[PDB]
Every structure is written in C-alpha cells, then in structure tokens.
Amino acid sequence: VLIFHGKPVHGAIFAMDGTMFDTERLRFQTLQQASQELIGQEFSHEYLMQCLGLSATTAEKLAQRLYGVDVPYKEIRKRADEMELEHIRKHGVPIKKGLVQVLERLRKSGLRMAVATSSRRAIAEEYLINANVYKFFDVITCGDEVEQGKPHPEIFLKAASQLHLDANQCLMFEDSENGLTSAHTSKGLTILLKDIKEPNDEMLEKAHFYYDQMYDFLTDLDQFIPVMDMPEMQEPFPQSLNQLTVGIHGFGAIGGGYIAQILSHWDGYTKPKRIIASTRNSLFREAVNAFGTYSIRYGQFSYDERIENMSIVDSDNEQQMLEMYTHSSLIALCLPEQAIESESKIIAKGLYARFNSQLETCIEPLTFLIILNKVGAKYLVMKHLKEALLELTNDEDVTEHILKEHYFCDTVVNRMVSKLSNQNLYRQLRIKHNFLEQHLEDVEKLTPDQLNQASIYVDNMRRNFQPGHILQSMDLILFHSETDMPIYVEKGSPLLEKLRQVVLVDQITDIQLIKNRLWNGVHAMLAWYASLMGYESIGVAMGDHLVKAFAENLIAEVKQGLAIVLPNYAKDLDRMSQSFLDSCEYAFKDPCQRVARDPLRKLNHNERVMASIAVNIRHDLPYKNLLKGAALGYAYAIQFLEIEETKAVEHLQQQIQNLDLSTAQRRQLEAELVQLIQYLFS
Amino acid sequence: VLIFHGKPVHGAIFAMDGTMFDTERLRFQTLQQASQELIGQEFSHEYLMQCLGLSATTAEKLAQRLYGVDVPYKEIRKRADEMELEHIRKHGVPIKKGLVQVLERLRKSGLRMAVATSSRRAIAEEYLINANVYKFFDVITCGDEVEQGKPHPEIFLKAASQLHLDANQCLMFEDSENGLTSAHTSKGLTILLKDIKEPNDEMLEKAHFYYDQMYDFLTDLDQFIPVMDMPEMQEPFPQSLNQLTVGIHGFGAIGGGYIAQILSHWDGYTKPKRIIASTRNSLFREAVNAFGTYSIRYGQFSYDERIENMSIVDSDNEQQMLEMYTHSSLIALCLPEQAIESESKIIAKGLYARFNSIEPLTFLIILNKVGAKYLVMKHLKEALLELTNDEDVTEHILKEHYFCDTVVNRMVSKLSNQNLYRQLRIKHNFLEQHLEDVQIEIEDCNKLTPDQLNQASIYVDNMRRNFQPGHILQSMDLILFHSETDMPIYVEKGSPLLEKLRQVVLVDQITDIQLIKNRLWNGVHAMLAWYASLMGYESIGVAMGDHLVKAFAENLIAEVKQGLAIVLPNYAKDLDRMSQSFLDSCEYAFKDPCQRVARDPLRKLNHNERVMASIAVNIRHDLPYKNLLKGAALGYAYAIQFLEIEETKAVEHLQQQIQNLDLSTAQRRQLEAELVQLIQYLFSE
Ligand SMILES: O=P(O)(O)OC[C@@H](O)[C@@H](O)[C@H](O)[C@H](O)CO
Ligand SMILES: O=P(O)(O)OC[C@@H](O)[C@@H](O)[C@H](O)[C@H](O)CO
Ligand SMILES: [Cl-]
Ligand SMILES: [Cl-]
Ligand SMILES: [Cl-]
Ligand SMILES: [Mg+2]
C-alpha cells in the first residue's frame, strides 16, 4: 500500500492544464491574440487569471460579466484553440518537468489513476496522446461531461467514483485556485503545485501539501517509494523516458560497454531521453548515429543489450561538448589517465558555459562521476579542472563557485569491457550493409475525406520506416563485456539516491582497498605467472590447469584476510571473487603485458601484493600462493623488464622492512621469498 | 554440466560447413565452376567427395596427386570462394534447420561452446557473423591454425583446450567422414549428422549418436532440456529467431492482442522469424506493414508490448493465404462464429496446397465455445469435398494435422478505426517534425586503410539516410489492442510442438478446464450481471463502484474456487490465479453491458450449469454457499422482473433443477426453502 505522509493512498487524480502540462501560459497568448482580432482588445490578465480551472462554459459566463453579454467568447475561444492546437502540432505538448517520473512511480505503486480536467474531451485526449501519458490513466473525466464544473467538487468526485475509490483515498493534483477548491471539497489529499498564480494564504491553507514545481513533489514522493533492487543480467530497461539528458565524456570501453547500461537502467521507473557520448573515433560516432543505437554483447549469455537514445558527438567539436555540459544532469568521465590533462580544458569550457547559460537545466547542480581505475582519480581530475577553469575564466570567484556547485564523485568499477577494433567494426558494417541492400530489394467506418488523408499518412510512414524494419533483428555490436553489475559510488549527490545499479558508499577508500588487493592484485600476479609460463593473455593462460588453480587459491587467500580486516564487506568480497574468476576465464583480449606493467611499484609494502601477505601473516592465514605471486613479480621484472638483480633485492628488502611484522616474520618472509625467486631461475 | 543420455557434458564443439550450415553443396558447385574455368574441366565428383572435411591446404595436396603437381588449386579455390561469398552476401548463410534452437539450448545449459572448422578463419568468422551465430561461441578454431588438419584430431583437441575443457567432456558435432575421424580420435562425445555423404558402417560405428538432420538432434535434446516457466508480465521475448513461420488466421482482438504474444514468447529459447496475420481491415493491415511492428497495451501496468516480425496479409488474397498454410508450422484460427462459414473455404484451399507441395501443422482453435472445434471441422470438411472431390485425400489431411480447441481467459479490445486514424495523424505529425530536424566522410581512424575509410563512409552514409527517419520508432509504438494481463492458454494435449511452448498449458482433458471456465468465469460473471441490473446499473464496470457488488464478486469467486478445488484438485494452482484474474478484468469492464451477460437466466440456472452445479458441489462437500445461493436467487429475480418470465414458471424450474441435483432429500428441501426465501426477500426490497 502506498503511504504518503501517513495516509494510505490507493489512487491519484490529476488536473491536466497547468498541472501535467505547461499549456496555461500558451492559452493566455492564444486567447489574447484571438480577442484582439475579434473585439479589438486583448483579454485582460485579471480575466485570464480568474479563468484558471474553469471550463469553456463557465469562462464564457465570466467573459459576459466583464465584457458584455454580446461578447463573442465562443468565436474567440474557437480561434484561440485552433492556434493552440497548431502550436502543439509544431512543437509538441509542453510537459511539466518530472511528470512521467511521478506517473511511473504512482503506477508502479499500484494506484488507480485518472485525469479530472475542465478542458473538453477532444482537447484532453489530443494532449494526453500527444504527450504519451494517456497510457497511465484508467479514467478521464472532462469539463464538457459534468453539470457543475470547478470549483464545484463534481469532476473530482466523478473521477474518484469511476476509479472505484473514495475521494479521501486519492491524491489530487491541482495548480489553480478553482481546481484546488474542487479537489479540496471532494475530500481528496490535495497537492498544490505552483503554475502561474502565486498561491495566496487561502490556497496554502486548504492544500494538504504544497510544492513550487512538479520536480519538488517528485523529490518528496521519492521518500515514500523504494529504490529498486540492483538490476539482473538480461533485465530490460525502463520503457518511459523522462526529460533528462545524461552524458558520457569518453565513449571508450567502460563508457559505452558499462556506464551506458547504468544510465539506461537509471532508477527503474524511467530512463533519460538522451545519452550524449563523446569520442574522437569518427567510425564509431558515425556508425551509432546511422543506427540511432548500439549494442553491448555479453558473451557468457550470448545476449545483446541495446542502448537506445544514443547521440555520439565529436570530442573536438566545442559546440557539441558545450551542449553536453549544458543539457546534462549527470556526466560520467570515462577517460584514460593520459587524457585527463588535455580534456580538463574541455570540461572547464563546458562547466563555464553551464554557469553562464540561463536554461532550466543548469539551475540544478551536475553529478560528475569520475570513472578511472586509479587511486586518487578524483584528486587528479579536480586539480587539472581547477587549473583549466582558472585560465579560462580569469576569475577566482567564478572558478570556486563552479568547483563547489557540482558533485564530483569517485567510483569503483569492476566490469571488464573490450571496445571493438576498427577493422572488426568495418567488417560488421560491410556485412550489415549488404543485409540492408538485400532488404531494399525485397521491399521494391471513416469519411472519404479522412480515408484519403490516412492513405497519405500510411504511405509517408511506409516510405520512411520500411528500410529501418531490418533494425528489429539487427544490432550494432560495439562492446564485449563481462557480467559485473554494481558500480560503487561516493555518497552525497541526491541524483544518485534512486539509481538502481549504483551502490552508494560513505567513504570510497574501503572498496578501493578491496579493488586494489582482491581484483588488481590477483590480476597482476596472475599476469606475471602467465607471462613467465609463455602466455600472451589471461584467457589463454586459464587453459593451463596450474594457472587456473593458482588464480582460485590466490583469490581465496586474499579474501580470507580481507574478510577479517573489512567484515562489513563480506558479501562484496564473495561477489567480486567469483566475478574476477568468471571475467578471467575467457579474457582473450586482455594482454598480460598491460596487467603486469610496473612490477616494482605493484610490489610495494602498501600495494596489491605485500600488503595482503602482511595481513595473512598477522592473522595466521595461509600465504603460500601470495608469496609465489610476489616471487613471480620480481622474476618478471628481471627476466622481462631488464631490472637488475641488485635493485630487485634492494627493493625486496626495503618493502619487507616497511611491513608491520615481527623481526622473525620479516626474516622468514625475506628468506622464503628469495628462495622462491632462486627456485624460479632453474 | 548437462546430462545428455546419462553422459555429463561441459562443452559443445561444432563443425561449421555441412554441420551448422548447408555450404558444402554450394562449395561443390563453385569448385565445379572454378575448375571448369581454369583447368578446362569440372573437378570429379569423387575428388570433391574426398575433400569433405579437409582444409584448403590438405585438399590442394589431394588435387596435386589426382590432377598433377602443377594444378592451380589455389587459383581455383580463390575463384570458387569468391563466387560462394557473392552467393552468401546475397541469399545469406544457409543455416541447417534447428541450428539456432540447438545453440540457444546448449548456451542456456551453461555449456562452453566452440567451432572447429577446416575452413579459413576469414571465411569462418564472416559466415558466423552473417548467420548471427558468432555470439554463441567462446572460441573458434580454424583450418589455417593447425599443423595437421582433419582427420587428425589436432583441431578438435585445440578447440577443447582453448575452451579449458577435456575433449571427453565436449559434445562434438560432425557431418563428414574426415571430420568425424578427427572428433572421434580426440575422444569427444561425437554426434553425427547426415549431410552429402551417405553414412557408411565405419562412420555409424565411430559415432556415439546419429541423427539424419539437425532437427532430429533438437527433438532428442528437448528430452533433457527443461521446459521454461510461464512468462510473466513485461518479460521480454527471446532475442534469437528460429527459421519457423507461424500464422494467425484472423487479426482481431484475440489474434493480435493475445495469440501474437504467445507466439512471440514461443519456448523462451527462440521465437519464429515471421508471424503472418490475416485481416480484411486495410487500415489495420497497411498500418502494421508501414511500421513493421504493432504494440499491445496493458493498461493495468501502462506497458506497451511491441510485437516484432509481423506480416499482415489480406484475408481475400488467395496467394497470400495459401503462403500462410504452406510456410507455417503453427496456425491459430482467431475468427468469430459468423465468419467460419466463409473462411472455411480459404482453410481448405491452404491445407490442400500444403500436402501437394511436409511436417504436420499444429492448428489452434481460438473461439469462445464449448465445442468450437466442431463448427470449424464441420465447415472445413464440407469445403474440402467441393474443392478436391476426393474422400481418400480429405481423410488423410484431417488425420495428419493437429487440430485442437483451446480455453482462453484473456479479454482484449481491438482499437477502433476512428481512434487508429487519430493515432496515425498524431504519429505522422511526429515523423514530419522529426524529418525537419534531420554526405558522411569518415577519416583519421587508426588501423584502417584510406580506401577502407572511404568504403565505410559509403556504408554509413547509406545506413544513415535509410535508418534516420525510423529512429523515432525507438519510443513510438503503433497501439492496436488494449489487453488484460491473463497469461495462460489451455490447449488440448497431442501436438509435440506445444510441449515446449512456455505460455501454453497442456491438459489431459479439455472438459475439465471448460467446466472451470463455465463455473468460475462465466458463472460469477452471470451472477454479477444479474446483481448489477437489479441494483440499477447498466454496466459490469460501473457496478464495481458499488462496494456491495465488489464484495459479492470476491465472495462468489471464493465459494466457487473451494468447490472446484475438491472436484478438480489437479487445477488447484490454476483456480487461485484465474480467480484474481477474473476480479482484475471485471474492475474496469465498462465496455461490456449487463444485458448480454445476464441473457437466458433459466438456461444458466440448470442443475448442470454455471450456478446450481457449484451450489450442489459445495453442499456435498460441506463448503459455504450463501453467496452462491444469493447469485441463484438474483437469476430468478432478473428473469421475473426484466425478462417478463412468469413467477410460477420460475418456481417450477427452481423445483425441477433442485430435483435433478445429486443431493439428499433433506438437502434438496433445505436448498429449496433457502432459495425461495431469498427470492421473496428480493421482492420485499
Ligand atoms: O482543469 P484543468 O487545469 O485541467 O484545465 C482547465 C483549463 O481548461 C482552464 O484553466 C482554461 O485554460 C482557462 O479557463 C482558459 O482561460
Ligand atoms: O570442418 P568443416 O565441416 O567446418 O569445414 C570443412 C570444409 O572446409 C571442407 O569440407 C571444404 O568444403 C572442402 O575442402 C572443399 O572441397
Ligand atoms: Cl521528467
Ligand atoms: Cl554553475
Ligand atoms: Cl564576496
Ligand atoms: Mg575511481
């Protein structure tokens, strides 16, 4: 049962104009233009304000009081409605920000829903179908269907009666003083949203709850509806689109093959209407924009996940990058460490444009996710961003205001993704182009007035849509990824509170430590073992029984010490361990060289190998596989990276001396480690 | 792990040419043509038969012995491969029937899968991408990557090693003599499929399992493959398309708004590549054919379910209707009672053309009637006699095909033509505005030659101009039906095709689910209509607003459910789900009037009908029947007041039905007094 502010709610009834849609402001202009053309004067602001919530019949009676019994209101209204339907035909129904997010929350909560509007059925059905919100309502009650319109309670009492609920079990959404009175008298749980009239004390008194805008009600409603569970593999994305735009700065492997799935799942109720991703790969950009979508292939389940509403922009195109930072609510920076410095100038330009623009998107702060498998990624990005903003604005006050306005969130990503090579994309485009060519070979009770009009609609639609019919079973595969779902994100941004694929953490350091030791540690040691055994990738190495056994034992050893050091992360350790082993199995596009790089840095006392050894020695847990991994590291540095034996031993003795162990444990470790290194050289 | 005939398998390694695809017959023709051109003569049939399973390098050595050390086999093979790739680019890769159905079952069973082919890597990857099967394999092993090709086991050993499995844990699929020897020598669990060569005694002995075609293995695998659970609301359809075609004879509310979802879910592993639906509504027909798809709207969850691969044909088009009966595997007849007479002539023409041109057709009867199969088979057999004039052929057609009546609980409403016109007008305007918002030159891309970039620019430009107008279809649905969320269809057991369909519930006897439909669905519906009419309401949905009518429906559905659980305890789980589904569908049934449902009260008040039979069952099993007794009293009150049935004539019927009920003399006299008192109490109000 949906509980809202202590009250059990079973239904929700909405006023349409001014509450769901921003159509009262447009109607003010059409009625003013139609009255100017017919009675030589515009309808006053006072008359049009008094009309809010009234049906065309009651608004006609009000026009006869102020302008005279012979006022041609029916002719003025008819002309205004025609101009209004023409504006809606050219630009669409202006939907109040957050409406579909609210509707999907109430629908998924099991509420019976209705519209109670003073507008006539024809206009109401036009706007509800045009805005694609008609599907959310069981009942529609209109102004031309009630004897006593607003402020009389009849229309709300009738909508509640048609939903088979008492008015007091219904939330009633209103914007006008007349409408609010109708809903309040009916006995509904009134929710007043500000539209044109600044609510007076009488409106604020009878309203059960008041919000300045639909988004503010959405924020309150979120406290009464749950955060959806972590998505499963193959679970579909939400159908409904909200009005938000999200951005992926860097359409590489993790951005396209992972962040896009996170952003497409959004909160489970709705998903962004547009995802802007930036890349310098022209082939990738043009391919996505030709299809409108791309797909992520998950080899394990042979499942192609389609990422809809994608828009790929050129990274070097200043105007497209400004649009991403000006229209987006969330931006995920998915750049390599090498690109941070040069890209910070583009991030600065976009954040400065967001600061200067007067749009209704730049008012809310931006949530900036920093996606980088490096400890201190947030600090590296923030330092470069501050430098770039300072030289661009040449104003310390503007720079500080920008860096304090937004939520810069550090993250822990575990999913392994591989971006398709340009040669493989080219081959895919060549094969699917021939399919498109073959598809083009195969395809080559109404009045007569509207039956001929329908023939034009259907012909124009068949001509434009037919070539794209092949997209029903044709995907643009761009990424091959693993099945790891959760992204660990720093808590703080309120925009992250409902994202179902995000795991919020108060401090990111604990899951960063787990990532470093359990994931990166076992990965670097597995790469050193595989490099010395002659394998060029982890996936090929996993074919060797001794390599697969080493990986299973090495992760079981690290996890054992981590379960004691961080018992609050016990389930995460079990999940990440199996995730690592599953992702290592067929990792053919994961070369050993990149994973085994910088072995002396990875063999430091506080790094991914020696720190786990010290923990297992301090808690009397086995460490033979961890010792073998450390020995493989020093052997790899000497045999492959040409590091002198004298420097490897000097580094070995320095890190062991830095470890928090007894003198006996340090000596035993040093002797066992040097013994294994000498044994490897045979 | 997968238990296939007792054998535990962790992997599945497949040969490509001849096993997965029918490319050995095409390669035979291209090699005959290429040799004819370059050496003046066609390669002998014996040389090409010996080449089956061999790599291009091994086939070259064999050609040097039989034709001379200086034969241009490399030139002939390159020329034959180019003619084959041209044929494959046009017609597509010819997939062996059932391949994707097999791959998806092995993949969902958690098997590690690989391809071990004597074909060149560039040819193999191209064919697997083309046929959309590449995604089913973790690793591919090709003929140009081993030192010794088939019949040497190296390639099947390497495919198992790269899968990280022992060869004796992998099912190995083969078709040729050379390929089978490579698989058998590797120690894998060999499965032989018949391709070009007739399997000799040496091959039949080597093979652990033998099948004449890929579809035979699919039927054998289905014995060890678990059937998928009943689909849930909003659960997506399978991504993989099989090669089957299905048909819906009658694209109305039940055909388009229900059967299409069952056919789209299919078995959960794959779904038919094409669903042909017939209709006389040219506005509906041309709309689906313009969009490519249509959607079913489920108001309860505000969910639009898109139905893909639909092909709407004209019911009067003889050619299109004949094509539906010859290409389809399953056909659902979704036409009303009145159309049966005229449409039976079209079904007769289609079924006659099917046996003139292989597998038995599974025909589903989708019509609301206990014995609707009789009406269809009566007019169908009469149409076959006046068209074929042969009783011996007519008897063979009706005996081979799987004709089966069904029980449908879902209520669906077809969109009106006026509402469809408004929708077309609003969506056309969206397309028109989208076209106002909307050549490509790709450069500076690494690892691609300047000519490859120019060629990619052409492909992508052609794709952009063709797909761009249809980009709006990602969030634009062609809503044609408004449907309830009732999922299971009850079908007569018999057809083996219906054994794996996840949305189909097979029954031992259809009489049992027809009786449940009569007492639980039609029974409570009639008793609700009688109550609503006497209360003053003229609609079922309007009556649900009255709290006493809603509680009466919940109390009626509970008393009938308890009784039906004693008589038919096999449908205990079905009864509880059908009860809630009935209440959810009655809630907003404003479209359905009360006069239609409350029609003929005395016939529905018979001892064996939807009211008294439930009362007698409850009395005999000491279950409560107070609301069922009120429902019977409302039926007589409605007949007396609304239908001008004499009060004495209603009491005589009341006494006769109670006497026909299997109850004791004491229970009959108690029921009669209880019923008469309730009828007199209704007149007092
Ligand atoms: O009950 P609603 O808020 O859905 O719609 C009321 C409008 O029709 C009404 O406010 C008119 O726009 C107004 O009366 C015209 O001046
Ligand atoms: O191992 P497969 O069955 O996937 O492929 C074998 C073919 O490459 C081979 O049979 C050629 O078609 C043959 O060598 C041409 O004459
Ligand atoms: Cl929104
Ligand atoms: Cl700002
Ligand atoms: Cl200041
Ligand atoms: Mg990070």
DSSP B557-569: HHHHHHHHHHH-G
Compute CA A99 distance to the chain's CA centroid, rounded to the nearest angstrom. Answer: 17
Burial class of residue B296 in the structure, from the number of CB atoms within 10 Å of its CB (0-12 exposed, 13-18 middle, 19+ buried):
buried
Q: Which token pair is A87?
A: 């504006």
The CATH code of the domain at B507-684 is: 1.10.1040.10
Residue B98 Cα distances to B171, B194, B263, B551, angstroms: 17, 14, 17, 52
Ligand 6 centroid – CA A379 distance (Å): 10
Q: Which token pair is A322?
A: 């400004």
Residues B517 and B511: their CA atoms lie apart, in Å, by 10
3-class SS shares of chain B: helix, strand, coil, % to 5? 55, 15, 30
Compute CA A384 distance to the chain's CA centroid, rounded to the nearest angstrom. Answer: 25
B62 interfacial to chain A (CB closer than 8 Å):
no
Closest CA to A312 of A295, A324, A297: A324
Q: Please report how the helices B417-437 and B282-291 are oriented relative to each other, as an axis angle in degrees rounded to 10.
A: 30
Closest CA to B340 of B374, B385, B314: B374
Burial class of residue B416 in the structure, from the number of CB atoms within 10 Å of its CB (0-12 exposed, 13-18 middle, 19+ buried):
exposed
Task: Please give the angle made by the CA atoms of B388, B250 and B97, to the nearest 5 degrees.
Answer: 75
Distance between start and end Cα atoms, chain B: 70
**Residue pair B524/B557 in contact by the 8 Å Cβ criterion:** yes
Ligand 2 centroid – CA A539 distance (Å): 28
Q: Provide the 3-class DSSP secondary structure of residue A287.
A: helix
Residues A218 and A77: their CA atoms lie apart, in Å, by 34
Residues A13 and A308: their CA atoms lie apart, in Å, by 32
**Residue pair A393/A351 in contact by the 8 Å Cβ criterion:** no
Compute CA A222 distance to the chain's CA centroid, rounded to the nearest angstrom. Answer: 16
Residues B185 and B153: their CA atoms lie apart, in Å, by 6
Per the entry, the structure determination technique was X-ray
Which ranges in B438-509 belong to alpha helices (H)? 450-467
Q: Which of B303, B445, B482 to mutate to test the interface with A (most CBs of A within 10 A)?
A: B445
Q: Which token pair is B49?
A: 């038969």
Superfamily of domain A505-680: N-(1-d-carboxylethyl)-l-norvaline Dehydrogenase; domain 2 (1.10.1040.10)
Chain A residues in contact with B90 by the CB 8 A cut-off are 434, 438
| A112-117, strands of its sheet edge to edge | A139-142, A112-117, A11-14, A170-174, A189-193, A209-211
Place of tokens 């398309």: B241
Across the A:B interface, residue pairs with CB atoms under 8 Å apart total 203
Tally of CA atoms within 13 A in the half-sphere of B572 that contains its CB: 4
**Got the DSSP string for A565-623?**
H-GGGHHHHHHHHHHHHHHHHT-TTSBHHHHH-SHHHHTSTTSTTHHHHHHHHHTT---
Could you say which ligand is closest to the alpha carbon of residue A489?
6
B338 interfacial to chain A (CB closer than 8 Å):
no
Q: How far is B219 from chain A (nearest CA, A)?
A: 22
Residues A561 and B563: their CA atoms lie apart, in Å, by 61
Residues 6+ apart with CB under 8 A from A105: A218, A221, A222, A225, A269
**Residue pair A62/A233 in contact by the 8 Å Cβ criterion:** no
| CB B119 less than 6 A from any atom of ligand 2 | yes
Residues B308 and B478: their CA atoms lie apart, in Å, by 11
Q: Which token pair is A547?
A: 């390599």
Among A290, A302, A423, the residue with its CB nearest the CB of B135 is A302
Element (H, E) at B591: none
For B:109-128, CB contacts with A below 8 A are 125-126
Chain A CA closest to residue B166: A543
| CB B151 less than 6 A from any atom of ligand 2 | no
Residues B228 and B242: their CA atoms lie apart, in Å, by 17
Residue B650 Cα distances to A41, B21, B602, B632, angstroms: 73, 72, 8, 12
Residues 6+ apart with CB under 8 A from B634: B527, B530, B531, B534, B682
Q: How far is B50 from chain A (nearest CA, A)?
A: 32
Q: Provide the 3-class DSSP secondary structure of residue A169.
A: helix
**Residue pair A170/A115 in contact by the 8 Å Cβ criterion:** no
Residue A640 φ then ψ, to 5°: -95, -50
Closest CA to A676 of A641, A624, A621, A617: A624
Which ranges in A394-520 belong to alpha helices (H)? 396-405, 422-442, 448-465, 509-514
**Residue pair B424/A451 in contact by the 8 Å Cβ criterion:** no
Residues recorded for chain B: 685
Chain B CA closest to residue A127: B426
Residue type, A431: I
| CB B58 less than 6 A from any atom of ligand 2 | no
Residues B304 and A355: their CA atoms lie apart, in Å, by 40
A158 interfacial to chain B (CB closer than 8 Å):
no
Element (H, E) at A531: helix A522-532
Dihedral sign of CA atoms B555, B557, B561, B564 in order: positive
Q: How far is A287 from chain B (nearest CA, A)?
A: 6
Examine residue B151 and say whether the peptide bond preceding it is cis (omega within 30 degrees of 0).
Answer: yes
Q: Which token pair is B149?
A: 């090709």
| A274-279, strands of its sheet edge to edge | A310-314, A274-279, A245-249, A328-333, A367-370, A407-412, A487-490, A502-505
Q: Which atom of ligand 1 is nearest to the CA of A56?
A: 14
Ligand 1 centroid – CA A119 distance (Å): 6
| CB B365 less than 6 A from any atom of ligand 2 | no
Residues B598 and B488: their CA atoms lie apart, in Å, by 26
**Residue pair B562/B618 in contact by the 8 Å Cβ criterion:** yes
Is B427 close to A461, i.e. CB distance below 8 A? yes
Extended beta strands in B409-531, E state: 412-414, 479-483, 489-492, 504-507
Please tell me what resolution, in angstroms, this structure has. 2.3
Instruction: Enter the DSSP assignment of A5.
Output: T
Task: Please give the angle made by the CA atoms of A625, A629 and A632, to the nearest 5 degrees.
Answer: 135
Q: Which atom of ligand 1 is nearest to the CA of A20?
A: 4
Element (H, E) at B126: helix B121-130
Place of tokens 């259809």: B510
Residue A680 Cα distances to A144, A549, A647, A675, B13, angstroms: 90, 18, 18, 9, 37
**Residue pair B280/B335 in contact by the 8 Å Cβ criterion:** no
Residues 6+ apart with CB under 8 A from B8: B1, B2, B169
Element (H, E) at B383: helix B372-388
**Residue pair A304/A477 in contact by the 8 Å Cβ criterion:** yes
Residue B362 Cα distances to A5, B135, B402, B403, B501, angstroms: 56, 31, 5, 6, 12
Q: How far is B332 from chain A (nearest CA, A)?
A: 24
Return the number of other C-beta atoms located less than 10 Å from residue A389's C-beta. Answer: 26
**Residue pair B180/B208 in contact by the 8 Å Cβ criterion:** no
Q: Provide the 3-class DSSP secondary structure of residue A59.
A: helix
Is B308 close to A135, i.e. CB distance below 8 A? no
Q: Which token pair is B37?
A: 């051109």
A430 interfacial to chain B (CB closer than 8 Å):
yes
Residues 6+ apart with CB under 8 A from A137: A113, A114, A115, A128
Residue A8 Cα distances to A56, A488, B520, angstroms: 35, 35, 32
Q: Provide the 3-class DSSP secondary structure of residue B209.
A: strand
A314-328 burial by CB neighbour count: b if 16+ within 10 A, else e?
ebeeeeebbbbbbbb
Closest CA to A19 of A77, A95, A93: A95
Among B424, B433, B471, the residue with its CB nearest the CB of A457 is B424
